[PDB]
Design a binder for this molecule. Structure first.
Ligand SMILES: [Zn+2]
Lengths: 206, 97, 76, 227, 179, 147, 293, 42, 35, 90, 55
RNA sequence: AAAAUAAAGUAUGAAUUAAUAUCAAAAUUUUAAUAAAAAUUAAAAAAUU
RNA sequence: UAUUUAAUUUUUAUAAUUAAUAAGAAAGAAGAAUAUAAUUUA
């Protein structure tokens, strides 16, 4: 009905707006973002720092289904910026762990960020909205090219800091538990198999 | 009671009223040192204010209390004060009969 | 080679500078006591290059300070 | 052990840290001369696990001083090598600390270590000194000239006067360093340390005295300049 | 030294390399072709031998010992592989763990219960180790060129495996002679 | 046994300043609060000052925890709370003759006047409590369950 | 004893079936082996059975005797009426626990004079933080429960990131629970304490005073669902403040934890009724307690 | 020797020696009437 | 065992629950039923 | 590097790839416009009597992904009052 | 010791992390804004500016 | 088994020992007497205590 | 001292698809040390 306590005022810039709590609060407190793609791309470019990159991705991977086709094109365009075809696609490396004989390489929080982007895309374009890739080829090619830009099918070079010593971080697991966290991440699996099977109509009937 | 944080809840009051009968001989004229959270330092500063009595600590105006706990610095003063506030009426009752 | 000097790690995360954020320094200071000295509001564990403020981090009961862009001299 | 002097030296968190010594008796002896010195002279440059101990113990001494009780006087009197410093402890600290209840002693870790061993140096102080009678304006950034002279006073505070019974004691203590048998003790000490041999100790014929009369007639001069 | 002391290990998180994806002086993948070996009815050990020699690279005229160049063999239908007579029941598989109790004596039937694929892998291991033991890279590198699929379903349609047409010249059944 | 000298508060008034400035300012608060509730002088009984805590970690909802302007019911979709409004609290007690409805009515009128008093900070008793005399915060307590 | 009865796969055939054996033709189920449509692939010495008066009369008797005596044969109804998915299958259902904190130690009496030493655990904020099904393989699903909400500046910069991606408020601690697909609850679900019935037995994983320990039998004593405590009759070797991972002990020596005699759990998650408000509710009236041991 | 998800059924895995650790075969060793003997006549 | 779930401890947050209050509450419940 | 962990070193990623090849089935049974979870038949013979003449039972449990997808997506209804307000008898 | 160790055994000890952390490790520092000396954060000097505000 | 003492430390800096190749881990039999000698299968990463 | 075992390589959000019976920015004190993550403090 009414406030239980007083609310101290703030001006227009410093309010916490841009998000919304889930429909049923007292049971589920999940936070869903309402932010437009323009200001998320803006947050991605204007504050180049790692945490704002992750912060942009966590919002635009929450909202994938809730935007149109071209709105996705500007997204993948904005996201494909720090990637060179020649260079290793996904390697973001922070800590050198010299603990063992041969130095270990640990990535930062950007890696699972991009991967979570790809998996959200997987849930949107394959499972709950299978028609969308077939409808517009534009984002078919955009998604395919972004998916080729980070190299999703050789994750081993996500973890490789020196190309003379290729790192097997992705392809290796031992039963005592090494690489449970870096283990086999089906990443581009469902997407690529699906968008191959969109082109798999070999039938002359249609 | 003793270890309560912040505000003193009513349940906590119930505790004190329970321990009223725990000790058979008690009068509102009893010395300060029987109170919860009255230490050495807390007793002394009450004494120089000419307060010997549970009645007298129940007679405080609450702006004597705060400068007892802030300007002077007997801490946990509102605990003992409130402890008086609760217990002075029942004591009078038990004193009559 | 260019020289082997390290650039500033003073603003990064450090696990032994991390413990002093929530530690109680009342006796260390005679005149100048500050609310929480090592604690940088909005930044992960006192580190200035780790800025989280005015991002989407959902923290229902704790405060967050708004974003003002950090200067050049504060980082390095 | 909850009693605010008597010490518990363990490593568990309920106990204040034991600093290395020969026996707990020895720990007590050490602690006693540390506290005595700190009460005499507000700062101690103290290495190791000793300094936090000094912090806690100084807080205990100020607590006893605030007690202002004959039992407190007596129990502090058991603890110190100096009887006189006990009197100082009950004259000074209450007025000094009347506005503070908690953490009376400031510990400051120094970035320099003993050359002798790796142990770190801590600078332990009493807190606010502008309320103190004899320590009012003193500067500890650097030491005094010869260590029997009263320490540095801040330029803006020069004209401060101190309790007479304290500078009486201080002058009586300092007056045995101007007699020549101290000079003989000084040279003979050079000889001794040189024999036990310790490097960088000059030969006793190079050791020209700490105290001369010209230096005294300038030191007393500037001392009445501070007065 | 030449070969380093700090070495890539199984417990080390870097992990163990796959020689198919490795690029090294002695690894040549340029001139390889893919084979399809249907194991229906053929004896396990024989199949192991043939596969071992296509895999190792010995079927080529230009084969050189230090240069590892193999053909990828897709061995299909491991489940139908035939071991003669009582042998399924009588042929041991022995290994020794270094710890108190150094004997595991395990029947072919048990290995077949756990994985059929491990049997073919075992005999491939043997037939490759028959000529290469003394160097690890020469033992391990060929074996990854076997693709062991225990029925007729395999991912490899895209390599167009050519059916490897082979009849065993040996008339008699396989014979277990191991001291 | 009936419940003894426990008193249900009217409002709890916060201040960003620490406890030692406010003891000087106590008597000037009651003169203002009396004309907030439009009652005559001496009607309101102010409780003891409570300095809550200096929290490095800020445990929320705690007995000594500094209150914050932002509230969950007040802003639901905000992902965090506005920073600390009040470091010291003092309770407001009325006469005992006011029953539970009356007390809450004088509690509500207060939040009404004080909220706007803070929003005038964008002669009358509100900003007199806000501007030249400090109070940054106010609340209605929860009725305690413990009887 | 500690083995079940041994039945070989060869031994399951028409002559061993408790109920009538049924053959599958794929559009229809019949009691006659499928006669192959190509007659020339009929093997010699094989009788293709189009009718059998021996095996059809027993089926005839059986079915009727079922509909005619429904009260005697209710167990037989298990054959024709399988439980659908969800609906708390007793043998197939594994739900998640929650993350506690060792708060303090206490003492209680039961109905008789008996001194118990209770250890009191606290459940500060339990929310389902994450779902992980690993590559869609069956029986591989995990639900991640977080606890103890924590300020933005606490965790290392890679932990906070995770929490931001999830959408869940930042937690001090997360623990995974392997569970069956039916036992899921959505991300961000506030978990209450009466998710654990006061009668049950609980599996406990915590840190010893310095490796991890697991206690697999421990019964619940008492529940404060106001202050979100739970009481347990044990003295742990554990530091006060240690995060303790809870689970249901899913079988005790041949007996299932949840059964009609013993009882039934509130299955995927507990949910509180809409009409209760804990801010109106005292501590003592908020109490739950076990039957006497 | 059980790890991962364990079902409340009292002893399911006890006859293969208490574990779940392979389970990915469709093919096992067989007497007559056992599994892969689908395709043979008896 | 060095993991995060095990090493991290909740001591600092213990003010969020009133330990001393609940102990006394169950004292009340001790004398109410008469143990 | 024993026999077996090298074996799994090589082959577990291959098992994963193979079951990926199993998952593409549903995928072209998706792409062409069909939507079906490929059904598993119910088995009426789960009750048996062994050679020592005692009752042996087999448990078949079928997971429904359209139920699961609904299970994770929305809350369960309110817990019935027979559950928590009465204890579990030991 | 039962035998002379060659240069390799002598060189084996330097691959270890204990050795590297002890001996070849660079210290992080800045300039004391009051004293202009190189300084490790958390260690201060005896100077009356540097005791109250310890920079 | 509580109590007192002593072990990461900065500095100094010996002694027993030393045929060795970056090493030699596990098992089996054989060979003129333990056999770190053979052969075969195998499965021993680095540092520190 | 060599092998051999046991522990450790200093918070890993997470653990186990197999072997055998697991690792994100760094060192002073892990404590500002008298068991509160500041008991108001000049
Ligand atoms: Zn300085």
């Amino acid at each position: 009905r009414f406030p239980s306590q007083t609310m101290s005022p703030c001006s227009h810039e410093e309010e916490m707006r841009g998000y919304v709590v889930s429909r049923d609060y007292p049971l589920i407190d999940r936070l869903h973002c309402t932010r437009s793609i323009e200001e998320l791309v803006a947050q991605f470019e204007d504050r180049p720092q790692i945490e704002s990159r992750v912060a942009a991705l966590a919002d635009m991977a929450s909202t994938v289904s809730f935007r149109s086709d071209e709105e996705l094109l500007r997204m993948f365009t904005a996201i494909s910026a720090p990637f060179s075809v020649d260079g290793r696609g996904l390697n973001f490396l922070t800590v050198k762990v010299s603990k063992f004989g041969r130095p270990y390489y640990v990535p930062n929080s950007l890696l699972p960020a991009y991967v979570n982007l790809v998996d959200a895309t997987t849930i949107a374009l394959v499972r709950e909205q299978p028609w969308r890739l077939s409808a517009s080829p534009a984002l078919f090619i955009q998604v395919l090219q972004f998916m080729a830009l980070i190299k999703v099918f050789e994750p081993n070079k996500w973890f490789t800091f020196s190309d003379h010593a290729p790192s097997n971080r992705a392809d290796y697991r031992h039963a005592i538990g090494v690489n449970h966290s870096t283990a086999f991440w089906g990443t581009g699996e469902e997407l690529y198999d699906f968008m191959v099977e969109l082109l798999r109509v070999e039938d002359d009937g249609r | 009671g003793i270890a309560t944080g912040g505000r003193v809840t009513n349940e906590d009051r119930r505790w004190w009223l329970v321990h009223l009968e725990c000790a058979p001989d008690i009068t509102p004229g009893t010395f300060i040192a029987w109170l919860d959270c009255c230490g050495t330092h807390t007793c002394k500063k009450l004494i120089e204010r000419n307060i010997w009595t549970i009645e007298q600590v129940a007679a405080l105006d609450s702006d004597q209390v705060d400068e007892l706990k802030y300007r002077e610095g007997c801490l946990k003063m509102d605990v003992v004060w409130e402890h008086a506030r609760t217990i002075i009426t029942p004591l009078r009752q038990r004193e009559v009969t | 080679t260019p020289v082997r000097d390290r650039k500033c790690t003073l603003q990064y995360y450090n696990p032994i500078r991390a413990r002093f954020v929530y530690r109680r320094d009342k006796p260390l200071f005679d005149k100048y006591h500050v609310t929480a000295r090592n604690l940088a509001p909005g930044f992960s564990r006192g580190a200035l290059k780790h800025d989280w403020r005015a991002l989407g981090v959902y923290t229902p009961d704790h405060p967050q300070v708004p974003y003002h862009p950090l200067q050049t001299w504060m980082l390095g | 052990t909850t009693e605010p002097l008597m010490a518990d030296y363990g490593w568990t968190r309920g106990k204040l840290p034991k600093f290395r010594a020969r026996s707990p008796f020895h720990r007590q002896q050490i602690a006693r001369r540390m506290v005595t010195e700190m009460i005499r002279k507000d700062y101690c440059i103290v290495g190791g696990a000793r300094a936090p101990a000094l912090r806690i113990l100084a807080d205990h001494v100020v607590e006893l001083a605030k007690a202002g009780d004959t039992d407190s006087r007596q129990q502090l009197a058991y603890f110190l090598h100096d009887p006189l410093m006990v009197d100082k402890a009950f004259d000074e600290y209450p007025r000094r600390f009347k506005d503070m209840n908690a953490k009376y002693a400031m510990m400051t870790r120094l970035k320099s270590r003993r050359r002798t061993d790796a142990v770190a140096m801590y600078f332990v102080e009493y807190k606010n000194r502008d309320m103190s009678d004899n320590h009012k304006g003193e500067d500890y950034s650097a030491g005094p000239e010869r260590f029997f002279l009263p320490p540095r006073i801040v330029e803006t505070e020069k004209g401060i006067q101190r309790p007479p019974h304290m500078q009486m004691a201080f002058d009586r203590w300092a007056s045995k360093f101007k007699t020549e048998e101290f000079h003989h003790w000084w040279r003979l000490r050079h000889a001794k340390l040189r024999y036990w041999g310790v490097r960088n100790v000059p030969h006793p014929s190079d050791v020209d005295p700490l105290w001369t009369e010209k230096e005294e007639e300038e030191w007393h001069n500037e001392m009445l300049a501070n007065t | 030294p030449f070969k380093s002391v700090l070495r890539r290990h199984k417990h080390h998180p870097e992990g163990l390399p796959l020689y198919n994806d490795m690029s090294k002086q002695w690894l040549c993948r340029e001139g390889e072709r893919w084979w399809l070996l249907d194991a229906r009815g053929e004896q396990l050990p024989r199949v192991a031998a043939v596969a071992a020699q296509y895999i190792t690279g010995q079927h080529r005229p230009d084969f050189t010992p230090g240069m590892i160049t193999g053909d990828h063999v897709v061995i299909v239908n491991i489940k139908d592989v035939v071991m003669v007579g009582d042998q399924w029941i009588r042929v041991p598989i022995t290994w020794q763990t270094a710890y108190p109790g150094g004997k595991y004596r395990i029947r072919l039937t048990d290995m077949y219960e756990r994985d059929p694929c491990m049997l073919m892998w075992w005999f491939l291991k043997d037939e490759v180790n028959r000529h290469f033991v003394r160097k690890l890279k020469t033992r391990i590198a060929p074996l990854e060129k076997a693709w062991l699929y225990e029925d007729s379903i395999h991912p490899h349609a895209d390599k167009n495996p050519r059916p490897l047409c082979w009849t065993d010249p040996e008339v008699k059944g396989w014979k277990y002679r191991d001291p | 046994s009936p419940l003894f000298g426990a008193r249900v508060p009217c409002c709890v008034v916060g201040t960003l300043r620490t406890a030692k400035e406010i003891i000087v300012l106590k008597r000037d608060i009651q003169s203002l609060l009396c004309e907030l509730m439009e009652l005559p002088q001496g009607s309101v009984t102010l409780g003891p000052l409570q300095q809550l805590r200096e929290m490095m970690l800020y445990r929320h909802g705690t007995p000594l925890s500094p209150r914050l302007g932002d509230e969950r019911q007040l802003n639901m979709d905000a992902y965090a709370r506005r920073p600390i409004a009040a470091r010291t609290m003092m309770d407001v007690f009325l006469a005992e003759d006011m029953s539970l409805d009356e007390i809450v009515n004088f509690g509500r009128l207060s939040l009404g006047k004080l909220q706007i008093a803070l929003n005038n900070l964008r002669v009358e008793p509100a900003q007199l409590l806000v501007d030249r005399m400090g109070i940054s915060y106010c609340e209605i307590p929860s009725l305690d369950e413990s009887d | 004893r500690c083995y079940p009865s041994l039945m070989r796969e060869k031994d399951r055939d028409m002559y061993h079936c408790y109920y009538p054996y049924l053959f599958d033709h794929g559009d229809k189920m019949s009691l006659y082996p499928k006669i192959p449509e190509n007659p020339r692939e009929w093997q010699p010495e094989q009788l293709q059975t189009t009718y059998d008066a021996i095996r059809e009369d027993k089926y005839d008797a059986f079915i009727r005797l079922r509909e005619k005596f429904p009260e005697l044969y209710q167990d037989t109804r298990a054959w024709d009426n399988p439980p659908p998915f969800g609906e708390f299958n007793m043998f197939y259902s594994v739900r998640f626990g929650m993350v506690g904190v060792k708060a303090f130690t206490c003492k209680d009496y039961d109905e008789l004079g008996n001194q118990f030493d209770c250890t009191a655990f606290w459940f500060p904020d339990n929310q389902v933080v994450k779902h992980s099904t690993r590559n869609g393989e069956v029986g591989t699903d995990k639900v991640y429960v977080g606890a103890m909400n924590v300020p933005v500046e606490f965790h290392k910069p890679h932990v906070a990131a995770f929490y931001k991606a999830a959408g869940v408020p930042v937690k001090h601690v997360c623990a995974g629970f392997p569970i069956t697909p039916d036992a899921y609850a959505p991300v961000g679900t506030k978990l209450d304490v009466r998710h654990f019935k006061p009668g049950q037995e609980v599996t406990i994983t915590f840190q010893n005073t310095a490796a991890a320990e697991t206690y697999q039998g421990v019964p619940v004593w008492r529940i404060d669902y106001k202050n979100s405590l739970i009481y347990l009759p044990t003295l742990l070797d554990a530091d006060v403040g240690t995060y303790v991972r809870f689970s249901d002990t899913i079988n005790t020596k041949g007996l299932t934890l949840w059964n009609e005699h013993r009882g039934l759990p509130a299955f995927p998650t507990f949910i509180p009724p809409e009409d209760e408000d804990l801010s109106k509710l005292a501590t003592d009236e908020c109490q739950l307690k076990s039957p006497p041991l | 020797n059980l790890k991962g998800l364990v079902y409340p059924l009292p002893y399911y895995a006890m006859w293969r020696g208490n574990h779940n650790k392979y389970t990915y075969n469709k093919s096992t060793v067989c007497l007559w009437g056992e599994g892969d003997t689908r395709s043979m006549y008896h | 065992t060095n993991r995060h779930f095990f090493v991290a401890r909740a001591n600092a947050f213990f003010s969020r629950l009133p330990i001393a209050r609940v102990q006394r509450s169950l004292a009340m419940e001790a004398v109410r039923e008469g143990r | 590097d024993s026999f077996k962990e090298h074996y799994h070193r090589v082959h577990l990623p291959r098992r994963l790839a193979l079951q990926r090849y199993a998952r593409q089935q549903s995928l072209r049974n998706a792409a062409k416009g069909n939507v079906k979870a490929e059904e598993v038949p119910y088995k009426y013979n789960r009750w048996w009597v062994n050679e020592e003449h005692e009752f042996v039972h087999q448990y078949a449990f079928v997971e429904d992904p359209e139920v699961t997808k609904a299970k994770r997506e929305t809350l369960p209804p309110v817990t019935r009052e027979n559950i928590w307000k009465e204890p579990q008898q030991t | 010791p039962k035998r002379k160790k060659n240069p390799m055994q002598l060189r084996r000890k330097v691959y270890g992390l204990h050795f590297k952390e002890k001996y070849l490790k660079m210290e992080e520092w800045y300039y004391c804004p009051l004293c202009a000396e190189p300084k490790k954060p958390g260690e201060w000097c005896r100077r009356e500016d540097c005791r109250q505000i310890k920079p």
